[PDB]
Ligand binder design. Sequence first.
Ligand SMILES: O=C(N[C@@H]1c2cccc(O)c2C[C@@H]1C(=O)O)c1ccc2[nH]ccc2c1
Length: 167
Amino acid sequence: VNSFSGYLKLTDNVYIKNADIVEEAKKVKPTVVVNAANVYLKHGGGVAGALNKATNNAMQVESDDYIATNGPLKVGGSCVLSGHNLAKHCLHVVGPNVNKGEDIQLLKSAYENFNQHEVLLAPLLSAGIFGADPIHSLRVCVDTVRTNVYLAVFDKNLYDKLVSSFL
Ligand SMILES: O=C(N[C@@H]1c2cccc(O)c2C[C@@H]1C(=O)O)c1ccc2[nH]ccc2c1
């Protein structure tokens, strides 16, 4: 038993809710919140900009130190950093950004990072400003992630479409 409330169950291990991932994290304080990161960990907009703003820019400060030490992530890769006031940990995961021409097949590799964590609060990778089809992102998620994932979908109209079209 865990503290996520109001989710619709899609599969054995994937759940979904129309919610603001920032507000959900602020209320649940999950062990892991996933950020929709880029390889530079520049949290300017979309989910990343919102999560970072909610940390009062502490996420960005920590991220800049991480990059200065380690260099950029790979598309499809991830790193674990602090969750600040939102979660114990933040898993920064880089899905491919279609608006940069990145190979959509890397989306499966991106979701594989979730399997290293027993339970996660997460957005749909490569959705939103990353330019992928969210219906496809959900199919890859369901077919790749084996751990328990609670997906927060900000847009109500999109949430209803994701549910109504789910096979
Ligand atoms: O950019 C976000 N979300 C994406 C989005 C936005 C508009 C239409 C979309 O289809 C999508 C897919 C993504 C998702 O829902 O994960 C997002 C998330 C939480 C937020 N809180 C405060 C600002 C804010 C923005």
